[PDB]
Structure 1
Amino acid sequence: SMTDLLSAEDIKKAIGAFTAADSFDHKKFFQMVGLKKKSADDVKKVFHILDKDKSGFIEEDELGSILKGFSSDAADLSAKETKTLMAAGDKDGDGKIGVEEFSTLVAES
């Protein structure tokens, strides 16, 4: 239910903004998609959509498919881009992103 939280306009814009020349940058992404302006509560609702298996964490598979949370046709991040985002978000080093870490990722964006 991402379009309950973010607009199709912003989602298109956010995904359409990166060329191959651009490093996928979650900071730019979360800004352009509209997530930085959402309440903390809506950021957590975004988190739970991303947490596809509802394990309470965004694990590395789910993280590589992050963009699919916003637009299901979007491609996965590459291994490298996925691990870059995991390095940014995974502050306790357990190899997955919890609720706090996800909010932090958005806050740092």
Structure 2
Amino acid sequence: MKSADDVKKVFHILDKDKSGFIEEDELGSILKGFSSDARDLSAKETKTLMAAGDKDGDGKIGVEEFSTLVAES
């Protein structure tokens, strides 16, 4: 389990425009937020991930939804 501070650090790295949410144009870099040597997601993978992760349906991923995505299974 990653700490809340660690999770927020990655969220901030992904939120390039500081909007407070990860929009579609920022989500493809998600694996890179954790390890710079990770691959980019394809456009199709990004759209799929956005749909799966956007639990409240507002079209973007906020901090709680992002935390849920990375919660330890």
Q: Secondary structure at the match of 2:13?
A: helix
Q: 1:53 to 1:72 in 2, by over 3 A?
A: farther
When the two chains are superposed, the root-mean-square deviation of aligned CA atoms in Å is 2.0
Structure 2, unaligned stretches of length 5 or more?
A: none
Per-residue deviation, residues 50-88 of structure 1 (Å, max 9, x unmatched): 111111000101001223434557553212100111122
What TM-score results when the alignment is normalised by the length of structure 2? 0.79
SS in 2 for 1:85: helix
- 8 Å CA contact 2:10, 2:34 repeated in 1: no
Partners of 1:83 and 1:73 in 2: CA distance: 22
Q: Which runs of 5+ in 1 are unaligned?
A: 1-37
Q: Contact 2:20–2:62 (CA<8 Å) still a contact in 1?
A: yes
